[PDB]
Write a protein that binds this ligand. Structure first.
Ligand SMILES: CCCCCCCCCCCCCCCCCC(=O)OC[C@H](COP(=O)([O-])OCC(O)COP(=O)([O-])OC[C@@H](COC(=O)CCCCCCCCCCCCCCCCC)OC(=O)CCCCCCCCCCCCCCCCC)OC(=O)CCCCCCCCCCCCCCCCC
Ligand SMILES: CCCCCCCCCCCCCCCCCC(=O)OC[C@H](COP(=O)([O-])OCC(O)COP(=O)([O-])OC[C@@H](COC(=O)CCCCCCCCCCCCCCCCC)OC(=O)CCCCCCCCCCCCCCCCC)OC(=O)CCCCCCCCCCCCCCCCC
Ligand SMILES: CCCCCCCCCCCCCCCCCC(=O)OC[C@H](COP(=O)([O-])OCC(O)COP(=O)([O-])OC[C@@H](COC(=O)CCCCCCCCCCCCCCCCC)OC(=O)CCCCCCCCCCCCCCCCC)OC(=O)CCCCCCCCCCCCCCCCC
Ligand SMILES: CCCCCCCCCCCCCCCCCC(=O)OC[C@H](COP(=O)([O-])OCC(O)COP(=O)([O-])OC[C@@H](COC(=O)CCCCCCCCCCCCCCCCC)OC(=O)CCCCCCCCCCCCCCCCC)OC(=O)CCCCCCCCCCCCCCCCC
Ligand SMILES: CCCCCCCCCCCCCCCCCC(=O)OC[C@H](COP(=O)([O-])OCC[N+](C)(C)C)OC(=O)CCCCCCCCCCCCCCCCC
Ligand SMILES: CCCCCCCCCCCCCCCCCC(=O)OC[C@H](COP(=O)(O)OCCN)OC(=O)CCCCCCCCCCCCCCCCC
Ligand SMILES: CCCCCCCCCCCCCCCCCC(=O)OC[C@H](COP(=O)(O)OCCN)OC(=O)CCCCCCCCCCCCCCCCC
Ligand SMILES: CCCCCCCCCCCCCCCCCC(=O)OC[C@H](COP(=O)(O)OCCN)OC(=O)CCCCCCCCCCCCCCCCC
Lengths: 98, 140, 120, 50, 55, 63, 52, 347, 459
């Protein structure tokens, strides 16, 4: 298939493995999650423009809006963790081991 | 690693000992790398050197289990001249169990691994013989 | 399995051809067992609120029995309907494919040879 | 009744016995039809067993 | 020796100790989200490259 | 009970249970053939409804 | 559980964006309108196992 | 929480699951999962302690990862089919990604690693919603894509879920983690029979939801989250010990109880398809789930652990908690096996 | 069988609606009426079984087991009302309801025409037995013993579930009446090898097989008296009943699959009997004697000759009555000395002479004294195993020495010698206890007058 689709899929997998290998910050995890969402937006957009499938052109905007709402929810969770420990470090989120 | 098991089963029993031993060694090495990967995943090593030491230990342990399993099974099928016989994989599984007990430096674990892995290898041979399906395709 | 059969008329609990089937009797042992489940629900409801178990809330126990008999009657109608659809599709498929369902010659035991295995 | 509890098991017997007889009429497919026991009905008789 | 120890050892005690040890290996997780997602990554890699569950 | 009653009751039981067993074997064979071939009423997994297709003259003719 | 509420009520909640060959604004055809119409009209109603 | 806001948020959770169940477009499937997660996050943060924030963060991260993998599977389906019908997928890569996404949303092993934490971090009612209502939408999507689900992948997920949910609950003393590992093992049982007969998948899901709702309703009615506080129940309310006894014996699949009903039928549908080793090892591994159920029944009903003195004050008050459907769910989780052929209503 | 199922179910409102001083007497009365009605099962024919319905039937194998099952409930009520006299009223009613529920599972275990209904009732018998042991057992070890009793049975029987559903798919039915006429020969293979093991190992655990018997000297020791009576008198016989139903489907492979298990029983009845020579716990001595006697039933089923099945069903009925009486005698001492140690209370014939006569008769029927049905079953299994191999008589006869030796040593230690001086709470025998001994022993001796009703389907 098309050569640009390779790069958009590979970008999704790069942001996946960034989201699947944390360092310390929860914000870096949220950024990897939104990089995944951005790559999904780009790939859906290039297909829908490429196929001239007219009614799915509203689809990526929906894919934006919901997920950005999702992002807002994630930011609030980070802030609540940041209102508990002072930082957003994921190693402070370990009370549920016992 | 689906082709690993196929190239293990493609050689007839008691015929070509070296490539059977190598195929079981490679299957054990793949399984040991899987165990090593999940082990350094869910339990963080204190260093990179400790992590690769755990990885090499588990990989060499499982590869030695596979090597001595395939060697003992093929030599037993050679000297007994009975290729379709699950007693050969019984002795091979007990040899791999003694290998696991020697790697864990303990005799009780060795006898337990002998018994259970010998019964497991005998069941795998009987499933190869009568066509037992574990991932059975839906027919009805 | 039968997902294509109940897809041309979707979300029908009892279709119209279910009315061609005889309904479960009001003295169905399955329906009487569901009424017994309602009676046990009434007893457990008196027990968990520390009421006298057999005496308190006879209207409530009777509504338990009534609700389980009422729901279970329709559940038994749907059960009988789905096993009827199962057998109907079975028989129409056997009739529509005789090359797959041959009539096997039943041999008598004077021709059938079985190996004898002596217990001694 | 002052001793109503001493009939729970015997009536539960009889009713159960009753249902057993009631099941026999559902298993009356081969009544007077087996190759061993089929025979002509005697007069003033409609079934062989009940 | 037999019916207080060895026939007691082989079927119930070794299986019971095996279930105890596997239970302690499963439930010894440190509650760290980093390690659970690193395990999920290793799951996806063994699923694609080692087991060919996408072919 | 009479030996007649028990005997013919047993034969009724045997007829009912043998018919149920033959129908269970047929049910297995019918499910096998319908999953294999897909030409029966069972295992009819959906495809796209062709009542959704637009058949009007479009903006460009080559379609 | 696909509870087919849209066919039960007769409403079109999401069938309109489902295929490229559906009704489009200003009758804009997809670039594979004809091929998808042929694949759907071939595969319609016969089930997915026979459609493959 | 404001009760009006609570009602609107719970109707939004239900609306998300309904939009997953009733829609014919993959974007609306993804939208229903997004709506479900977005509304269920405040139900988990109902009490505002750091454990609920940690549990909601872990739940958000796993469900968001699953939603993005779901949308990538949808987008690859759009590549290789040009359409959006919620049916079989037209690429094994999209099938693998959607099976991974739904195994994450169900919390099946080895994506199970969020289920015992999050259930421990949230209250018992939100744990009830998570372990019963949040299974219905991904199992519906698995119900509709089973022509494309790879057999080896879903069976590996099934046996790994049954074994890990077996060994996980053997070390536990918290009741919410016990119910969570029970959840993992039961989801393994539900997806092991998905490609063979999905009606038994629906059966196992319904019987599981009844038994789980019974156990969480008993835990709420007694205000018990640990084993050792459940062991005080005989001195407070002796009927509840009999109820947890029969319901824990039912969840272990002991006949003549209703929880023997699914797994038996599952074996009954896996031997027709000539799999004998697999339901045998599944049923042998279910003895682990039975073992920690028996541990709880020894702690609660069949022995009497010592109580405290302040229990004498709690004797002077009856339970005013609304035990909604608790006798109904107790009956329907124990005495239902003589009505086993009712399962044809799920066909 | 619905004329026996419904009175057993009506024992539940009979025991939950009785007055508090009346809940033993009413249940004892009406359970004796059910046991009196249990003799209508004796309408057995030389050719056909008594086939009630599609669900229920009874041949001459299940009929003595059903009469013994319906007879054991009043005796369990008599045995278990003294030590539960101080019990709470609702827990006392729950105990009686567990015994009634266990009888209700047993009578449609033995009459199940179809084998998966047999499996469902056969595993439903776990739950009242498990609850009785782990709730009304006396010592600490009852929880562990309940775990062993549960997880040997289920580990043996969940393969049996898969095996029975496999027969269901292959043959089309699990009706025993159909499978009498549609049974196919089971050829030699590994598939049929593990088929045979999955059919047989659940019943090997239930008998118990030697080597799998480790649940029994805990579960029969850590239980109350009614639990020990129903375990050693009925619940060990589910295994023999299930083997006699299931070895129909396992031919001709059984003719060489039986060879290890026969060894495990023929040596096992040498070992466990020898264990009874050196047991300190009297209840454990009766437990290992139960393992020793059931090893003969395992051998007789696995050699599958007519004399062996006749002797095996005679020995099962006889051992049920004998071992239940022996547990009741051990309880009659344990209610007085509060210890199961056999060397503790000696010389009890000096204090309880009629109870020592009951000990004597139970020990003489234990050692298979002719013409008791104990000896009839013992002797017929010996005849059939002599026809199997002429050497086995050695392992039989040596067993028949040791079976004498523990049966009289138990009599010599408990009843003979000089009495223990510091024990002074040895009350005279209550009328309930001697009533229980006579209701065990007088049916067992009357069956010597007419043994053909306990000789099974091929008399
Ligand atoms: C019926 C079954 C369900 C009954 C539930 C309620 C039982 C109850 O409360 O009884 C108490 C009540 C007497 O007590 P009470 O003074 O009123 O109040 C309770 C006391 O305070 C009691 O004192 P307490 O509570 O202060 O403390 C004592 C303590 C004692 O407790 C303890 O000490 C703790 C536990 C002790 C050890 C455990 C024992 C075993 C318990 C579990 C049972 C497992 C086996 C079940 C089957 C195996 C599978 C699990 O607790 C109790 O005794 C609580 C009461 C419950 C006892 C009975 C439990 C029955 C429910 C469970 C079994 C049935 C359902 C599951 C079946 C599963 C599959 C078959 O008993 C009855 O009324 C019994 C029923 C008598 C009449 C029956 C009439 C039947 C009529 C049928 C025909 C009419 C209907 C027709 C319908 C169809 C129309 C078309
Ligand atoms: C599996 C084979 C055994 C390998 C695991 C051994 C236990 C774990 C261990 O290594 O602990 C050391 C270590 C620390 O434990 P530890 O401090 O030594 O604790 C033990 C004490 O020292 C106590 O002292 P000890 O070490 O001297 O005694 C340990 C005792 C050894 O026992 C004795 O020393 C006395 C008894 C003699 C040996 C056992 C004989 C058993 C005979 C078979 C049963 C009867 C069959 C009858 C057949 C008749 C017809 C032919 O072994 C056990 O308790 C384990 C028994 C076997 C485990 C698996 C059982 C699964 C049953 C499932 C249902 C069937 O644990 C670990 O590192 C955990 C991970 C283990 C590493 C991997 C091991 C190799 C796995 C290979 C793949 C296996 C796949 C599954 C095959 C079977 C299913 C298809
Ligand atoms: C051919 C390639 C493909 C083969 C099949 C696929 C490969 C996987 C096989 C099945 C899964 C086995 C377990 C894998 C993970 C290892 C467990 C682990 O992390 O252990 C660390 C850790 C243990 O450390 P610990 O708790 O700190 O304490 C240990 C002591 O400090 C000291 O402990 P230690 O030094 O004594 O040893 C510790 C460790 C070391 O273990 C070893 O060194 C044993 C390695 C294998 C030895 C035996 C190999 C035999 C191979 C077959 C025979 C060869 C010839 C065959 C020829 C054909 C047949 C005739 O032992 C274990 O991990 C034992 C427990 C797990 C059982 C392993 C059974 C492997 C069977 C392989 C059969 C193939 O355990 C955990 O963290 C448990 C929680 C893990 C939860 C997640 C697990 C997910 C696994 C997924 C696998 C499948 C993915 C499917 C993807 C698609 C669907 C999504
Ligand atoms: C179809 C599926 C139905 C599923 C269940 C539907 C109800 C549950 C969901 C909503 C809920 O929680 O409602 C409370 C729920 C009772 O749950 P609860 O709080 O545990 O009740 C304990 C006591 O009722 C507390 O006593 P209370 O003093 O507070 O109030 C007494 C109350 C007063 O009652 C009323 O006020 C009723 C009149 C209001 C209704 C609307 C009138 C306008 O009496 C009752 O409700 C008696 C119990 C009725 C039976 C409840 C369960 C119904 C059957 C469930 C399905 C069974 C399926 C068996 C299948 C087996 C074979 C597979 O339902 C009601 O209160 C009304 C039940 C009406 C049943 C009608 C069935 C046919 C409908 C067409
Ligand atoms: C008391 C504790 C121990 C209990 C032991 C119970 C019996 C021991 C053996 C059990 C094996 C598993 C059940 C076998 C069911 C056979 C049904 C059947 O169709 O067989 C033919 C089938 C044959 O397949 P098929 O019939 O579908 O094939 C078509 C026919 N041919 C062969 C011609 C192509 O056998 C099998 O499929 C596999 C049988 C062996 C299964 C091995 C896996 C289980 C491992 C051992 C478990 C032991 C107990 C575990 C618990 C221990 C304590 C915790
Ligand atoms: C064979 C080669 C194996 C290489 C990986 C094993 C080495 C290892 O685990 O290294 C440790 C590393 C964590 O780094 P560490 O140093 O512990 O962090 C503290 C700050 N220095 O650990 C990690 O980074 C864990 C993840 C490493 C990748 C695991 C999967 C591939 C390796 C295992 C299979 C081979
Ligand atoms: C207790 C545990 C009991 C386990 C019993 C397992 C019984 C064996 C079943 C699998 C087996 O060996 O099947 C034989 C089969 C080769 O035969 P076939 O089906 O023709 O394969 C060609 C593929 N088209 O081979 C296959 O299907 C693939 C190879 C399977 C090998 C299984 C063992 C591998 C090592 C451990 C993992
Ligand atoms: C421990 C507690 C006390 C005991 C409780 C009961 C536990 C044991 C229950 C099972 C007993 C063993 C299985 C039954 C033995 C049947 C006879 C047998 O297998 O003989 C040895 C066999 C001889 O060969 P053959 O039988 O001809 O095999 C070809 C089959 N067509 O030899 C061979 O074929 C070689 C060996 C093959 C491996 C067999 C493994 C499976 C069986 C054991 C498990």
């Amino acid at each position: 298939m098309s050569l640009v689709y390779m790069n958009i899929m590979m970008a999704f997998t790069v942001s996946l493995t960034g989201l699947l290998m944390y360092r310390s910050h929860l914000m870096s995890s949220l950024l990897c999650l939104e990089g995944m969402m951005l790559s999904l937006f780009i790939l859906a957009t290039l297909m829908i423009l490429n196929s001239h499938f007219t009614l799915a052109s509203m689809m990526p905007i929906i894919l934006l809006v919901f997920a950005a709402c999702e992002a807002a929810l994630g930011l609030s969770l980070l802030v609540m963790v940041s209102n508990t420990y002072g930082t957003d470090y994921v190693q402070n989120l370990n009370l549920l081991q016992c | 690693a689906k082709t690993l098991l196929h190239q293990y089963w493609d050689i007839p029993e008691g015929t070509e000992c070296h490539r059977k031993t190598y195929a079981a060694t490679s299957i054990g090495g793949a399984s040991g790398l899987v165990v090593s990967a999940y082990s350094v995943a869910l339990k963080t090593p204190t260093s990179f050197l400790e992590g690769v030491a755990r990885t090499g230990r588990y990989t060499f342990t499982a590869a030695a289990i596979g090597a001595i399993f395939g060697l003992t099974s093929c030599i037993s099928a050679q000297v007994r001249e009975k290729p379709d016989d699950p007693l050969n994989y019984l002795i091979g599984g007990c040899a791999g169990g003694l290998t696991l007990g020697a790697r864990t430096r303990s005799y009780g674990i060795g006898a337990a691994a002998c018994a259970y892995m010998g019964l497991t290898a005998a069941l795998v041979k009987m499933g190869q013989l009568e066509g037992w399906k574990v991932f059975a395709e839906p027919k009805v | 399995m039968m997902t294509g059969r109940q897809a041309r008329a979707p979300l029908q609990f009892l279709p119209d051809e279910a009315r061609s089937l005889p309904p479960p009797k009001l003295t169905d042992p399955r329906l009487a067992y569901i009424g017994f489940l309602g009676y046990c629900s009434g007893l457990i409801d008196n027990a968990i609120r520390r009421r006298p178990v057999l005496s308190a809330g006879l209207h409530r126990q009777f509504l338990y029995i009534t609700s389980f008999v009422f729901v279970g009657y329709y559940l038994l109608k749907r059960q009988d309907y789905m096993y009827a659809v199962r057998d109907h599709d079975m028989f129409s498929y056997i009739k529509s494919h005789p090359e797959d369902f041959p009539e096997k010659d039943k041999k008598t035991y004077r021709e059938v040879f079985e190996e004898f295995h002596p217990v001694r | 009744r002052d001793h109503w509890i001493h009939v729970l098991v015997p009536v539960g017997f009889v009713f159960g016995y009753y249902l057993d007889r009631k099941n026999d009429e559902k298993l009356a497919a081969f009544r007077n039809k087996s190759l061993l026991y089929k025979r002509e009905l005697k007069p003033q008789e409609e079934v062989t067993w009940k | 020796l037999l019916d207080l120890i060895w026939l007691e050892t082989i079927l119930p005690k070794t299986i019971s100790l095996a279930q105890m040890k596997m239970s302690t290996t499963i439930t010894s997780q440190k509650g760290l989200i980093k390690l659970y997602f690193l395990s999920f990554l290793i799951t996806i890699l063994i699923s694609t490259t080692l087991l060919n569950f996408h072919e | 009970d009479a030996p007649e009653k028990n005997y013919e009751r047993t034969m009724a039981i045997l007829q009912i249970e043998s018919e149920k067993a033959e129908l269970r074997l047929k049910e297995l064979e019918v499910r096998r053939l319908m999953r294999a071939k897909g030409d029966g009423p069972w295992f009819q997994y959906p495809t796209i409804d062709k009542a959704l297709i637009d058949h009007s003259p479009k903006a460009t003719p080559d379609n | 559980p696909f509870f087919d509420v849209q066919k039960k009520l007769g409403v079109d909640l999401d069938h309109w964006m489902t295929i490229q060959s559906a009704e489009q604004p200003h009758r804009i055809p997809a670039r594979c309108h004809a091929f998808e119409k042929e694949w759907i009209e071939c595969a319609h109603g016969i089930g997915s196992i026979r459609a493959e | 929480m404001n009760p009006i806001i609570l009602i609107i948020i719970l109707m939004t959770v239900m609306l998300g699951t309904i939009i997953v169940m009733i829609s014919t477009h993959w974007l609306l499937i993804w939208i229903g999962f997004e709506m479900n997660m977005l509304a269920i996050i405040p139900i988990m943060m109902k009490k505002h302690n750091p454990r609920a924030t940690e549990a909601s963060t872990k739940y958000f991260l796993t469900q968001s990862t699953a939603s993005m993998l779901l949308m990538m599977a949808i987008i690859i389906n759009l590549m290789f089919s040009g359409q959006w019908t919620v049916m079989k997928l037209f690429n094994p890569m999209a099938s693998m990604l959607m099976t991974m996404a739904l195994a994450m949303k169900l919390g099946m092993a080895p994506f199970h690693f969020w289920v015992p934490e999050v259930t421990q971090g949230i209250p018992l009612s939100s744990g009830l919603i998570l372990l019963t209502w949040q299974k219905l939408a991904p199992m519906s999507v698995l119900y509709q894509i089973l022509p494309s689900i790879n057999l080896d992948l879903i069976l590996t997920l099934s046996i790994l879920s049954i074994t890990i949910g077996g060994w996980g609950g053997l070390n536990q003393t918290q009741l919410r983690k016990i119910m969570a590992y029970s959840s993992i093992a039961h989801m393994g049982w539900m997806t092991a029979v998905l490609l063979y007969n999905p009606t038994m998948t629906l059966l196992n899901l319904i019987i599981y939801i009844i038994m789980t709702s019974t156990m969480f309703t008993l835990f709420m009615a007694n205000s018990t989250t640990t084993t050792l506080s459940l062991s005080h129940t005989w001195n407070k309310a002796p009927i509840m010990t009999i109820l947890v006894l029969i319901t824990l014996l039912s969840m272990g699949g002991l006949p003549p109880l209703s929880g023997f009903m699914p797994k038996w039928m599952i074996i009954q549908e896996m031997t027709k398809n000539d799999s004998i080793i697999l339901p045998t090892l599944m049923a042998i591994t279910a003895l682990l789930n039975l073992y920690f159920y028996m541990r709880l029944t020894y702690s609660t009903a069949l022995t009497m652990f010592p109580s405290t003195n302040n229990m004498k004050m709690k004797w002077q008050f009856p339970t005013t908690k609304r035990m909604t459907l608790l006798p109904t769910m107790t009956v329907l989780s124990t005495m239902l096996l003589p009505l086993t052929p009712i399962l044809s209503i799920l066909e | 069988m619905l004329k026996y199922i419904i009175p057993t179910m009506m024992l539940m409102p009979l025991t939950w609606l009785s007055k508090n001083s009346m809940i033993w007497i009413n249940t004892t009365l009406h359970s004796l009426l059910i046991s009196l009605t249990s003799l209508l099962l004796l309408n057995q024919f030389g050719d056909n079984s008594l086939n009630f319905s599609l669900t229920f039937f009874s041949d001459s194998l299940s009929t003595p087991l059903l009469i013994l099952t319906m007879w054991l409930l009043p005796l369990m009520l008599m045995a278990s009302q003294h030590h539960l006299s101080k019990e709470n009223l609702a827990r006392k009613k729950l105990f009686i309801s567990m015994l009634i529920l266990l009888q209700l599972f047993l009578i449609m275990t033995f009459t199940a025409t179809e084998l998966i209904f047999f499996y469902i009732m056969f595993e439903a018998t776990l739950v009242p037995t498990l609850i009785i042991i782990t709730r009304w057992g006396n010592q600490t070890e009852r929880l562990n013993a309940g775990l062993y009793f549960l997880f040997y049975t289920l580990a043996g029987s969940l393969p049996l579930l898969v095996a029975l559903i496999y027969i269901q798919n292959t043959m089309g039915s699990l009706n025993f009446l159909i499978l009498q006429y549609w049974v196919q020969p089971m050829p030699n293979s590994w598939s049929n090898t593990f088929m045979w093991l999955a059919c047989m190992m659940a019943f090997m655990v239930k008998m118990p097989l030697y080597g799998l018997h480790l649940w029994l000297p805990k579960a029969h020791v850590e239980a109350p008296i009614a639990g020990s009576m129903v375990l050693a008198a009925i619940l060990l016989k589910l295994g023999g009943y299930g083997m006699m139903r299931i070895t129909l489907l396992l031919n001709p492979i059984t003719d060489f699959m039986a060879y290890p298990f026969i060894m495990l029983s023929l040596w096992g009845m040498i070992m466990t009997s020898s264990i009874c020579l050196r047991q300190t716990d009297l209840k454990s001595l009766i437990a290992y004697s139960s393992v020793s006697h059931m090893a003969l039933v395992i051998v007789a089923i696995l050699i599958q000759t007519p004399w062996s099945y006749m002797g095996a069903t005679a020995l099962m009925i006889a051992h049920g009555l004998t071992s239940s009486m022996l547990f009741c005698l051990a309880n009659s001492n344990y209610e007085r000395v509060h210890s199961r140690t056999m060397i503790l209370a000696r010389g009890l014939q000096t204090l309880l002479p009629l109870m020592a006569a009951w000990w004597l008769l139970a020990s003489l029927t234990n050692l298979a004294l002719p013409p008791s049905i104990n000896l009839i079953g013992e002797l017929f299994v010996v005849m059939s195993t002599f026809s199997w191999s002429n050497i086995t008589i050695i392992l039989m006869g040596l067993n028949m020495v040791i079976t004498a030796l523990y049966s009289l040593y138990m009599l010599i230690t408990t009843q003979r010698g000089k009495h223990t001086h510091h024990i002074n709470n040895i009350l005279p025998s209550f009328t309930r206890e001697n009533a229980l001994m006579s209701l065990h022993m007088l049916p067992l001796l009357l069956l010597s007058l007419n043994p053909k009703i306990i000789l099974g389907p091929l008399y």
